[PDB]
Amino acid sequence: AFVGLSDSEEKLVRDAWAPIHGDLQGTANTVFYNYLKKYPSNQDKFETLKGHPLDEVKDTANFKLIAGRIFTIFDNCVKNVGNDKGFQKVIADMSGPHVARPITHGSYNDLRGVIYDSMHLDSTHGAAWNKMMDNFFYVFYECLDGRCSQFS
Ligand code: HEM
Ligand SMILES: [Cl-]
Ligand SMILES: [Cl-]
Ligand SMILES: [Cl-]
Numbered sequence: 001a002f003v004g005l006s007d008s009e010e011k012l013v014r015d016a017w018a019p020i021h022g023d024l025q026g027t028a029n030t031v032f033y034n035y036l037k038k039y040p041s042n043q044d045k046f047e048t049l050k051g052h053p054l055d056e057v058k059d060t061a062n063f064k065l066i067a068g069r070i071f072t073i074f075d076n077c078v079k080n081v082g083n084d085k086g087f088q089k090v091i092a093d094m095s096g097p098h099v100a101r102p103i104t105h106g107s108y109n110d111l112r113g114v115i116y117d118s119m120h121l122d123s124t125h126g127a128a129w130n131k132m133m134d135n136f137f138y139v140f141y142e143c144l145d146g147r148c149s150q151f152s
């Protein structure tokens with residue numbers, strides 16, 4: 001279920017995210033590369049990337065756009081961490097294009113973990129981060145299951 005963050009937890013999340021926020025596209029490029037390299041079955045889900053070696057696409061416009069738009073969503077979730085409806089709406093809006101896609105919970109959760117590992121958070125910040133990400137996945141998966149309207 002969705003579980004709100006305290007004011008103090010919101011601050012922890014903003015602080016945890018600050019290094020990424022200040023280098024959003026650069027972080028996105030690295031994290032998205034590391035994700036596709038560690039979990040190679042996922043590159044095929046991206047039609048613009050499909051059929052080419054990862055090291056050939058990593059430097060391309062198409063690749064950087066995809067990595068950017070993932071991180072722009074998380075950046076907007078963080079922006080909205082103190083507004084549950086606003087946070088939910090960010091997710092609701094990005095969920096529609098994923099609904100029909102053959103992407104497993106495993107794949108999404110693997111990306112969550114690459115992001116986590118990259119942040120090297122202490123346990124206080126990591127706890128707050130995981131509250132937010134648990135909310136993120138709650139909403140996202142509700143929307144993938146066609147129960148997106150409950151957040152409206
Ligand atoms: C969980 C965090 C994620 C976020 C915040 C996110 C965000 C986005 C955004 C903003 C769009 C752009 C709208 C569009 O052109 O359709 C998009 C589309 C798409 N995403 Fe995601 N995504 C996430 C995870 C994933 C994963 C893990 C995969 C595949 C393994 C994936 C595959 C796709 C595909 C294939 C598209 C449709 C556009 C395209 O064909 O690239 N997404 N996503
Ligand atoms: Cl894989
Ligand atoms: Cl490859
Ligand atoms: Cl994506």
Ligand SMILES: [Cl-]
Nearest residue numbers: 082083084086
């Ligand atoms: Cl607010």
Ligand SMILES: [Cl-]
Nearest residue numbers: 120121122125
């Ligand atoms: Cl930390």
